Design a protein around this ligand. Structure first.
Ligand SMILES: O=P(O)(O)C(O)(C[n+]1cccc(F)c1)P(=O)(O)O
Ligand SMILES: O=P(O)(O)C(O)(C[n+]1cccc(F)c1)P(=O)(O)O
Ligand SMILES: [Mg+2]
Ligand SMILES: [Mg+2]
Ligand SMILES: [Mg+2]
Ligand SMILES: [Mg+2]
Ligand SMILES: [Mg+2]
Ligand SMILES: [Mg+2]
Lengths: 336, 336
């Protein structure tokens, strides 16, 4: 699946850089330059989920070339949203690397103009949508699905940045309730509900109750997903993850820190307190030591299994009337 | 006009902060905090232009409360777009003040999270639109009008940042052709076409030829507008303009610098070259001295009059079949 999807990327790029009012040529050359560098190099879990869900939802007889194309197009739309969020996330998180290369905003000659660059990527989604699905009866729903999903993420992000003030030890606020809402808004909606709900709308399924049912499954899925992203932030092979963790020095409200706090003694708390949210490398090293002390990696592992089962029950409880494989597929690719 | 428009701002804020899923309350409290600080304090030339054009386009008998409300709402939509662009512009331009107060991103405890803050402001537009004009037959056209206008601005901005590389003397590229395209995309479309075209669509006028006709007028208007913004960047009373100029040290392709370059001797060029695009205060002072040397302020003044006349002919040539006052109004408020 992955490869046919990626090969359609040359069509996306050329269409978005088509127009050539040559007054804007330099600007378009820069856009393509932004697309190449930030859309390529990920797993495509989101773009791929749109394509694959579409195939499993639309009558095969009804999968003409045209409609097939609108599907990976809307798939590259979810990847553009991803790219937009990442370029700006890496700046606000002050990241060094992403997807095995330096962050776009760390490239010599880019810096904070990457803010505009990210906005362009956001703009491209809507450019593609009008360019391929304008005469379709789901046009508004897709557009509306991307707008609201963007808002929900911005809100989650706001939550995030709010719970991790810089220069401020924020231990008190790392609760579970809090973590659950952050993750729901900043990751789950756009990474799990969005690409599937887009396939649904494309397959003519726009009922409110089906979408809610899929949502019930997809959100909880998305939560587990972020919890994995957190574990991997600290406990993962960068060469594999293509980026380096910052949550700790960024005083983030991670699943990890939320777990340490629920298992630590006063003596451990204070270690945590004088050590979390600081740039000092050994201070960061101190916290990981706590976590490893507290057996959190086994705990995470225990979670993955407890979680995998819950979602499974969920798919059981709510997949209908969609082919269960729509979700199983997702769960399989994000269950390691 | 201005005041009834501003008083509707408490309705905008309360509606966008309505929802209270209390899990996101802190996030919503921050949004309102972003709305208050960045939507208020400008001239409202854009928001006001939507309201006023609407009154002059819709049959008075047809101006029910409901429809009147959708009008200032869509007016506060153009102001939100403005706010979004400004918050991010001030960061990328590394600004110190805006609208007579420190830039939102210079406030202690904000900094680069203002990137997310700006995105939220963008999101709010579409939130208001669905919240008031969803059942209207111009819904898509407005949404589509804001998306494309955003893209066009991002493109102009890209142009801008590209023509002003930092650390690079870019004199060669400050041509007129170049300046005209930058201004067309980064200012004109969203500041002059956008609020009027939104009123048109709201008045049931969506013909392609009328919009093009209004566009012909509005763009050229918008150009003059930016040229004024440039003059004011250097030659204006900050207390009046509420911000301070940076174009010079930002190595911007200003109308000014474009004019100096067309009037300067080799001896003046070299002064320009060793002095433009640098942070040294006296180096900046050197350039203004050149400009003042070159009689550019009279030149600008000569332009304003030559321009005012052209636009006037334009309104003459293309206002029909819209009430000419739709444009005259605009021209009057931006002709000092
Ligand atoms: O591993 P990262 O840093 O990409 C992350 O999970 C991505 N991300 C996730 C959700 C929203 C977002 F804007 C960005 P985080 O949230 O910054 O920790
Ligand atoms: O006086 P300023 O700095 O607001 C400006 O005219 C605003 N502005 C105008 C157009 C687009 C934009 F994003 C922002 P500039 O372009 O940054 O010089
Ligand atoms: Mg990050
Ligand atoms: Mg983040
Ligand atoms: Mg992360
Ligand atoms: Mg500026
Ligand atoms: Mg600018
Ligand atoms: Mg300016």
């Amino acid at each position: 699946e992955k490869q046919d999807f990626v090969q359609h990327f040359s069509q996306i790029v050329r269409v978005l850089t088509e127009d050539e009012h040559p007054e804007i040529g330099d600007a378009i050359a820069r856009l393509k330059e932004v697309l190449e560098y930030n859309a390529i190099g990920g797993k495509y879990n989101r773009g791929l989920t749109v394509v694959v869900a579409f195939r499993e939802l639309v009558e095969p007889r009804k999968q003409d070339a045209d409609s097939l194309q609108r599907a990976w197009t809307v798939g590259w739309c979810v990847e553009l949203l991803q790219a937009f969020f990442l370029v700006a996330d890496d700046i606000m998180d002050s990241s060094l690397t992403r997807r095995g290369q330096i962050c776009w905003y760390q490239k010599p000659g880019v810096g904070l103009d990457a803010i505009n660059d990210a906005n362009l990527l956001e703009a491209c989604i809507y450019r593609l949508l009008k360019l391929y699905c304008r005469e379709q009866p789901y046009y508004l729903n897709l557009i509306e699905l991307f707008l609201q999903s963007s808002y929900q993420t911005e809100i989650g992000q706001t939550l995030d940045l709010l719970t991790a003030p810089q220069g401020n030890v924020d231990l008190v606020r790392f609760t579970e309730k809090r973590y659950k809402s952050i993750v729901k808004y900043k990751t789950a909606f756009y990474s799990f509900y969005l690409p599937i709900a887009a396939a649904m709308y494309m397959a003519g399924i726009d009922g409110e109750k089906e979408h809610a049912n899929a949502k019930k499954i997809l959100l909880e899925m998305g939560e587990f997903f972020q919890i994995q992203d957190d574990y991997l932030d600290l406990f993962g092979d960068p060469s594999v993850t293509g980026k380096i963790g910052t949550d700790i020095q960024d005083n983030k409200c991670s699943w990890l820190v939320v777990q340490c706090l629920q298992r630590a003694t006063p003596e451990q708390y204070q270690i945590l307190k004088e050590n979390y949210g600081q740039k000092e490398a050994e201070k960061v090293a101190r916290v990981k030591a706590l976590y490893e002390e507290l057996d959190l990696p086994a705990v995470f592992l225990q979670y993955e299994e407890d979680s995998y089962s819950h979602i499974m029950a969920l798919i059981e409880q709510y997949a209908a009337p969609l082919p269960p494989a729509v979700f199983l597929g997702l769960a399989r690719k994000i269950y390691k």
